[PDB]
Amino acid sequence: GFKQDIATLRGDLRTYAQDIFLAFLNKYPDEKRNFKNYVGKSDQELKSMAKFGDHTEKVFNLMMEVADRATDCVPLASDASTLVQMKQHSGLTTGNFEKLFVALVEYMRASGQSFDSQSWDRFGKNLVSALSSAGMK
Ligand code: MH0
Ligand SMILES: O=[N+]([O-])c1ccc(O)cc1
């Protein structure tokens, strides 16, 4: 289920994190207006770029913490607040987050592995709800 999936992703997180983020950028190429320095690069070229690997892993490190702290795929309001208040998130709207979770669930459904994709869809929806409640446009 969802808690086991957190353990699965954590056991190979740099790889999963880069593969899901690449799935997101390829499904939604207009999302690169928040990643100017990732324009005009193939997947293998991005996985050679220091900030790509390090920023994407740090993102998924904290995503796994928020998922781990959730009850029944509902995040803590302290975590949603952190994600809204972060200077790094100044530009963003809830639809940026919805698109990331769409890509993440599609990734999971394509894997041969027994991911609980319905739980990840609920999590993404619940995080979007929480971000809206914590003041994200
Ligand atoms: C597509 C929009 C977008 C979404 C969705 C998004 C979703 C998430 N984020 Fe977060 N984040 C986005 C846009 C950014 C930007 C633009 C930056 C700045 C750093 C950069 O460009 O590498 C950033 N996020 C930076 C970060 C950083 C700091 C990275 C670093 O500087 O090394 C963390 C920890 C982070 N986020 C957390 C999270 C978490 C957790 C989620 C999932 C709930
Ligand atoms: O997965 N994400 O949403 C990310 C990935 C990398 C990054 O630099 C910022 C956000």
Helix axis angle for 77-85 and 117-133, nearest 10°, is 70
Q: Would the annotation count 4 as a binding residue?
A: no
User: To 10 degrees, what angle do helices 77-85 and 50-69 make?
Assistant: 150
Range of the structural domain that residue 1 is part of:
1-137
Instruction: Please say whether the beta carbons of 24 and 30 come within 8 A.
Output: no
Number of domains forming the structure of the chain:
1
Q: How was this structure determined?
A: X-ray
Give CA–CA dist 63/61, Å, rounded: 6
Q: What is the resolution of this structure in A?
A: 1.6
**Ligand 1 contact, 31 CB (< 6 A):** yes
Closest CA to 54 of 24, 12, 107, 17: 17
Under 8 Å between Cβ of 131 and 80 = yes
Of ligand 2's atoms, which has the minimum distance to the CA of residue 51? Answer: 8
One-character DSSP codes across 46-65: HTT-HHHHHHHHHHHHHHHH
Find out whether 51 is annotated in a ligand binding site.
yes
